[PDB]
Design a protein around this ligand. Sequence first.
Ligand SMILES: [Mn+2]
Ligand SMILES: [Mn+2]
Ligand SMILES: [Zn+2]
Ligand SMILES: [Zn+2]
Ligand SMILES: [Zn+2]
Ligand SMILES: [Zn+2]
Lengths: 162, 162
Amino acid sequence: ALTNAQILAVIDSWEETVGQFPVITHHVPLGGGLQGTLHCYEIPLAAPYGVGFAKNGPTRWQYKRTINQVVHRWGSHTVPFLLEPDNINGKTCTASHLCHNTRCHNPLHLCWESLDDNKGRNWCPGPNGGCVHAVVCLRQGPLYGPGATVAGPQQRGSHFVV
Amino acid sequence: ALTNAQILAVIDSWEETVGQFPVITHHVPLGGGLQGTLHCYEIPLAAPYGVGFAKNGPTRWQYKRTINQVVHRWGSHTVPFLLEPDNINGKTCTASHLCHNTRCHNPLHLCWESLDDNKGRNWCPGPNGGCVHAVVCLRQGPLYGPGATVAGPQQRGSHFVV
DNA sequence: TTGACTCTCTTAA
DNA sequence: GAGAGTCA
DNA sequence: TTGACTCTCTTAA
DNA sequence: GAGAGTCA
Ligand SMILES: [Mn+2]
Ligand SMILES: [Mn+2]
Ligand SMILES: [Zn+2]
Ligand SMILES: [Zn+2]
Ligand SMILES: [Zn+2]
Ligand SMILES: [Zn+2]
């Protein structure tokens, strides 16, 4: 199996290639009416993507390296966490974008957590609006807000109490 | 069926049958350190469930009525909203539990909204913890909290800026 | 060893 | 969160 | 007409 | 949010 040193070499190669990706400025809500700025290192929209990178789905990519004539492949966003536990509380760990920008591969924009924690950041009020995430959000979630509920609770008779 | 009066009669029949379901008291967090009480009308765990009701999945049921010698069937929680639009902003409308208790069919615990709004209620701080839902939550979401993130944003080198 | 494609899968509302 | 089919 | 089962599907992380 | 196959 790959040694820790070999894993670090994979991570170092990933960082060097991704650091050459275009760095794009995005102005984002932070919560409480405050705005901030994030810098995403964005993979190209079409091939070529960069040494070792290939698109396996509309917004899914993989990283590949050959070591001692054996081919190894990882999800493109999982590489910063190859030295971390792969599960927590009986749930699998996922790469999670604090920036909600799939093409972005900035490791300063990624955390390693459960799919429920990952999903939940979509509705978080944000670092300046009341975020309670132990690993703090970088922005207000894209889906925070009043929502668009079509109909609320209602009864025709009087069989029910709340 | 097709007539408003037929639709009203279905809702009246559904309300009468659900009104006989056992009423279960649940003590729930509301946000802000406050606790409250909800009264859920719970479908039985096994057959028989009630006139017109049948189980199609572990926590899935359907309501069925014969009208004009024709069988009409709906998802068991959708019946209160049969007169509402079936989509919103190009998104399908779903029945959404404010009590987060699938077995509960109390119409005072249900709303009609997109699936994103539905899911997002899982993380809401609650009616006394800062809920901004236009149609207000009845309790804090079951997944609100700091989370259990295994690893946060990090870099081995010095190529990236947040 | 490498690139650019192909396919199917998981979870919990 | 959904819809539809097979029996009795 | 009614009941009790069966199977597969949708969406967006 | 994932892993794996094919071909040159
Ligand atoms: Mn995410
Ligand atoms: Mn729900
Ligand atoms: Zn980013
Ligand atoms: Zn947060
Ligand atoms: Zn309820
Ligand atoms: Zn709410």
